[PDB]
Amino acid sequence: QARGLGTARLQLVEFSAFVEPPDAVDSYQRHLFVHISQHCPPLESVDVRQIYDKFPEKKGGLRELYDRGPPHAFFLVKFWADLNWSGGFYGVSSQYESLEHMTLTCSSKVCSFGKQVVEKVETERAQLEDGRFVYRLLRSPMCEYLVNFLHKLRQLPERYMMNSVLENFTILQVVTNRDTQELLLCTAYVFEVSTSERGAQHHIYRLVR
């Protein structure tokens, strides 16, 4: 059914992860590691069992989440990350959109070899705008674990080694209705590096079973 990253209950308007150099205050610029923009065909599909072992087990892992359902809320995003941009500002921004008013709880578990490593949980109630509610989680500071990992990754001598290391690094995003606990949107991210002649790129799949 789906054609973008979203459902009828909750659509992703924009997601990005970025850095602003210390110079940004005199002349502005930001460098986008990854960027989904859904302002203005069916998506490809990837069978969720094939990536079970890339996200935690027991509880809050991919197999029980999909088992809770609803199935249509699950997506996979391959990112090609741009790491060609010292002490600046590193941040993540997300905007979701619904027809109805809720409080959103957003967790993002970072995983390495399938073991949760860091997790951040942020909450966000709706702001009624043009006949629909919008949820704005803009400029969340990246946790120092990610920023350090970026600084280490950016230093390796070959792209293939960056991709090798990234083969074991994933991020899982679970958006739930805070009041009712129902799953609205669940999003697995897997990462390569882009040959930064090309900046960031992505490909969204639905996760089916």
From Swiss-Prot:
* Cellular compartment(s): Nucleus
Region (Transcriptional activation) location:
1-209
Specify the superkingdom: Eukaryota
Q: What does this protein do?
A: Transcription factor which plays a key role in the Hippo signaling pathway, a pathway involved in organ size control and tumor suppression by restricting proliferation and promoting apoptosis. The core of this pathway is composed of a kinase cascade wherein MST1/MST2, in complex with its regulatory protein SAV1, phosphorylates and activates LATS1/2 in complex with its regulatory protein MOB1, which in turn phosphorylates and inactivates YAP1 oncoprotein and WWTR1/TAZ.
Relate the assembly described in the record: Interacts with YAP1 and WWTR1/TAZ.
Protein name per UniProt: Transcriptional enhancer factor TEF-4
Say which species the protein is native to. Answer: Homo sapiens
Interval of the full protein contained in this chain: 219 to 446 of 447
